[PDB]
């Protein structure tokens with residue numbers, strides 16, 4: 229169908245509600261294949277969580293993973 | 300203050316040079332693949348702007364959330380924490396204090412990240428650092444009370460950690476007074492964002508003289 | 515290219531002073547650095563050292 | 564030691580396999596190779612143009628026209644070709660400056676992350692940096708950053724100081740933790756609880772001016788050998 233963005237108008241792509249990390253940028257936070265169709269969605273900013281903060285709670289690791297990453 | 304990006308200006312070649320003219324374009328094609336090169340260069344710097352903003356702000360793996368209770372041992376962070384009304388107050392002073400076209404070929408493209416999305420990155424970045432410290436920048440976020448985090452931050456500069464704990468309210472008052480003076484100086488004193496205004500003024504100057512070369 | 519150099523400096527400063535405590539003197543503020551808070555700006559970033 | 568060595572070898576095997584399977588994992592070198600080749604290709608392709616002349620190749624225009632009349636067309640072809648070449652040289656100068664910045668960053672990273680152990684966070688790998696390995700590339704370098712990523716955190720009740728016998732006790736390194744019934748000193752980055760002694764804590768002043776005091780008995784190692 230036809231979707232209007234702040235970047236412009238994006239035809240041929242259906243607009244969905246849920247958000248993922250995004251592959252092809254368009255602009256104004258809208259990125260775009262999934263399930264035999266071009267979708268368009270606002271960017272997921274990342275996974276969301278809240279840490280269990282209080283004034284006397286500390287969290288200390290017990291184990292550790294050594295990891296090797298390129299650059 | 301540091302600048303991280305420009306405005307993404309993409310031009311057209313035949314629209315700027317000729318513009319609804321078949322004869323001018325037919326003479327322009329004798330010059331070769333010149334404006335393909337010019338469009339490629341401007342497209343390259345326009346995607347470099349998004350690369351810049353992503354490498355500055357998008358450093359968090361996950362978006363962190365401020366706790367509803369704000370009892371950080373006496374420290375008052377409500378002057379930099381984001382507000383549910385609109386952003387943080389200091390970001391509102393910055394957005395007001397900076398004093399920022401599309402005529403023929405000259406277009407601006409929007410950035411990939413909206414200003415609210417960059418605000419959500421900065422909210423996550425400064426809500427992780429008041430509830431975890433640096434441990435959300437190494438592994439998973441591990442909670443710690445904020446006087447204890449400030450105690451080890453004192454321990455990292457050569458001062459023993461007691462010195463915070465007998466002087467905690469004095470440090471809290473000094474922190475709050477310093478943040479309030481930052482808000483007052485940004486609210487009253489102008490021309491402090493000159494570094495962040497020179498980039499916009501230089502881009503406007505270059506686009507304006509590119510327009511005036513048409514006459 | 516100049517903006518890219520300043521953005522690389524801002525990314526280095528954000529990763530080294532907000533995500534941690536910096537020990538290199540006069541990199542994040544005059545004095546001994548404790549912590550920093552980033553604030554968004556219309557075309558940039560500002561840190562509170 | 565054995566678990567650390569096994570994690571190291573498994574991580575090296577995983578990074579070999581991940582670089583092996585995934586295509587365009589070397590995009591940072593392939594991009595600069597592709598843009599240099601594209602600039603060179605369009606520099607070659609700017610010889611097909613006429614720039615307003617009647618022919619593109621210089622020998623066929625030189626072989627059919629008198630030098631008083633060939634002079635103007637050779638001059639305009641010279642201006643077009645020279646200005647195209649100057650555009651190419653300016654592009655290559657800016658690209659070489661960018662690659663110089665990248666090579667200075669790589670030299671700094673080799674000096675401070677292979678020859679040493681960097682305390683600049685997120686400069687060499689996500690995590691606390693241990694060591695790294697340089698590996699050659701076609702036109703670059705790849706570093707194998709070995710980092711320490713903590714895992715499996717546990718909640719604990721913490722207190723800033725312990726008031727024993729009217730004095731406030733602070734830890735030398737690490738934090739005071741409590742699983743609910745007892746109180747321990749652990750190092751901050753790994754849960755290894757020891758019993759609070761006077762050899763791993765230090766005193767300063769009375770225990771009433773500091774917020775967050777809990778009471779406990781600080782053990783003295785000097786005591787039980789007297790009896």
Ligand SMILES: *[C@@H]1O[C@H](CO)[C@@H](O[C@@H]2O[C@H](CO)[C@@H](O)[C@H](O)[C@H]2NC(C)=O)[C@H](O)[C@H]1NC(C)=O
Nearest residue numbers: 290291292293565566567568569570573714715
């Ligand atoms: C720390 O994590 C490591 C992750 O490898 C654990 O090691 C593995 O533990 C599982 C438990 O079922 C075993 O099946 C594997 O054989 C172990 N692998 C190795 C290489 O040791 C380790 O047990 C964890 N340690 C603690 C104290 O939790």
Ligand SMILES: *[C@@H]1O[C@H](CO)[C@@H](O[C@@H]2O[C@H](CO)[C@@H](O)[C@H](O)[C@H]2NC(C)=O)[C@H](O)[C@H]1NC(C)=O
Nearest residue numbers: 719720740741742743744745746747756757758
């Ligand atoms: C907190 O940790 C301590 C140390 O292990 C625990 O104390 C021991 O618990 C075991 C199991 O009941 C007993 O057999 C030992 O005699 C205890 N040691 C002492 C010195 O009393 C304690 O139970 C833990 N508390 C909680 C709530 O898990």
Ligand SMILES: *[C@@H]1O[C@H](CO)[C@@H](O)[C@H](O)[C@H]1NC(C)=O
Nearest residue numbers: 241242243244245246267268
């Ligand atoms: C998205 O959600 C709104 C309300 O939550 C709904 O009206 C709309 O139909 C949804 N979009 C699609 C494509 O289903």
Ligand SMILES: *[C@@H]1O[C@H](CO)[C@@H](O)[C@H](O)[C@H]1NC(C)=O
Nearest residue numbers: 369374375376377378475479
């Ligand atoms: C923080 O300061 C603001 C004004 O500076 C004040 O309105 C607010 O109540 C303070 N927060 C707390 C928790 O006292």
Ligand SMILES: *[C@@H]1O[C@H](CO)[C@@H](O)[C@H](O)[C@H]1NC(C)=O
Nearest residue numbers: 280285287715716717718719
């Ligand atoms: C710490 O406790 C809170 C509340 O009991 C809980 O939500 C949180 O998951 C706990 N943290 C961990 C790491 O289990």
Ligand SMILES: *[C@@H]1O[C@H](CO)[C@@H](O)[C@H](O)[C@H]1NC(C)=O
Nearest residue numbers: 282283284368370774775776
């Ligand atoms: C922590 O918070 C609780 C409730 O918010 C309060 O009763 C207590 O005095 C605080 N301080 C401590 C445990 O040092």
Ligand SMILES: *[C@@H]1O[C@H](CO)[C@@H](O)[C@H](O)[C@H]1NC(C)=O
Nearest residue numbers: 726727729770776777778779
């Ligand atoms: C700690 O011990 C002192 C001295 O007996 C007492 O006054 C105080 O109430 C105690 N505090 C707690 C939290 O038990």
